[PDB]
Design an enzyme around this catalytic site. Sequence first.
Site, PDB file in Angstrom:
ATOM      1  N   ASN A   1      -8.845   6.137   3.367  1.00 38.87           N
ATOM      2  CA  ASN A   1      -9.459   7.202   2.588  1.00 38.87           C
ATOM      3  C   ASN A   1     -10.265   8.251   3.364  1.00 38.87           C
ATOM      4  OD1 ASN A   1     -11.947   8.127   0.754  1.00 38.87           O
ATOM      5  ND2 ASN A   1     -10.233   7.835  -0.568  1.00 38.87           N
TER       6      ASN A   1
ATOM      7  N   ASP B   1     -12.377  11.866  -7.113  1.00 37.54           N
ATOM      8  CA  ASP B   1     -13.469  12.426  -6.339  1.00 37.54           C
ATOM      9  C   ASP B   1     -13.039  13.420  -5.259  1.00 37.54           C
ATOM     10  OD1 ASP B   1     -12.225  10.564  -4.555  1.00 37.54           O
ATOM     11  OD2 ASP B   1     -14.123   9.844  -3.794  1.00 37.54           O
TER      12      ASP B   1
ATOM     13  N   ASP C   1      -5.889   9.245   0.147  1.00 35.69           N
ATOM     14  CA  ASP C   1      -5.559   8.109   1.002  1.00 35.69           C
ATOM     15  C   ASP C   1      -4.312   8.449   1.789  1.00 35.69           C
ATOM     16  OD1 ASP C   1      -7.565   6.545  -0.357  1.00 35.69           O
ATOM     17  OD2 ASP C   1      -6.134   6.299  -1.948  1.00 35.69           O
TER      18      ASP C   1
ATOM     19  N   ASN D   1      -7.413  11.224  -5.021  1.00 41.15           N
ATOM     20  CA  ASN D   1      -8.322  10.483  -5.873  1.00 41.15           C
ATOM     21  C   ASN D   1      -9.230  11.461  -6.614  1.00 41.15           C
ATOM     22  OD1 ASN D   1      -7.656   7.700  -4.841  1.00 41.15           O
ATOM     23  ND2 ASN D   1      -8.403   8.501  -2.962  1.00 41.15           N
TER      24      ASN D   1
ATOM     25  N   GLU E   1       0.796  -1.211   0.000  1.00 38.94           N
ATOM     26  CA  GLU E   1       0.000   0.000   0.000  1.00 38.94           C
ATOM     27  C   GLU E   1       0.839   1.277   0.000  1.00 38.94           C
ATOM     28  OE1 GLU E   1      -3.348   0.481  -0.404  1.00 38.94           O
ATOM     29  OE2 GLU E   1      -3.858  -1.600  -0.382  1.00 38.94           O
TER      30      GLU E   1
ATOM     31  N   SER F   1     -10.990  12.856  -2.673  1.00 38.98           N
ATOM     32  CA  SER F   1     -10.523  12.305  -1.406  1.00 38.98           C
ATOM     33  C   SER F   1      -9.044  11.970  -1.513  1.00 38.98           C
ATOM     34  CB  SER F   1     -11.359  11.087  -1.009  1.00 38.98           C
ATOM     35  OG  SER F   1     -11.241  10.045  -1.973  1.00 38.98           O
TER      36      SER F   1
END
Length: 129
Positions: A59, A48, A52, A46, A35, A50
């Site tokens: 998220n 949209d 991480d 991201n 990850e 958001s």
Amino acid sequence: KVFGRCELAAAMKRHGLDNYRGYSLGNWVCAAKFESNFNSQATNRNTDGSTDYGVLQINSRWWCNDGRTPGSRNLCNIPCSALQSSDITATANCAKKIVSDGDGMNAWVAWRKHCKGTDVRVWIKGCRL
């Protein structure tokens, strides 16, 4: 902070992740490698809006508030910056919330691809844990 493999394993162990819900320590360590490459400051923005955060790339639309995400629900009740700390506490508590109610560890797609179904004891080998 970039954790060393054994450094991160021992920290996760201290916070109760070893075999939490039947998912052994090596699973959590393997998932963090793929990850974030063990980097607490890794962030992935991201489409949209958001991002991480942290070693497990949690998220901001659902799990933590970063003050910058349209419509954050903050289910772990933490600021996203808590996941960037060298203190793993907020990561461990929030990861426990994520695994308790969905597809378990399948929540992390890099875990499915690289860890699930393979020996993960090798991820903590040499750590004397």
